[PDB]
Design a protein around this ligand. Structure first.
Ligand code: NAG
Ligand code: NAG
Lengths: 41, 41
């Protein structure tokens, strides 16, 4: 909040609560998964 | 800070900010890599 330091959205620094219906003003964007699934081939 | 309880350095309990140049007094040590790369068949 108090300093400008942008970061890439990741599934680790954001938690998940419920489905997409109930909230108001929610926007549609993809969320990057952690490095380990990307490392897996 | 308030009690002595040493722990093994791990990539999960430490976050990463930038490269090695800008800080002062930084020392050279190896950080335990996560379990996913270690657990490879
Ligand atoms: C915010 O205000 C604008 C006013 O133009 C409105 O169109 C928009 O629906 C408002 N946002 C939400 C989430 O309702
Ligand atoms: C701490 O002080 C000592 C004094 O001997 C000095 O040599 C050292 O460079 C200082 N630490 C840093 C990070 O500058």
């Amino acid at each position: 909040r108090n300093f400008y330091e942008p970061q890439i959205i990741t599934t680790d620094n954001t938690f998940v609560s419920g489905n997409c219906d109930v909230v108001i003003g929610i926007v549609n964007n993809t969320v990057y998964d952690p490095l380990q699934p990307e490392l897996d081939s």
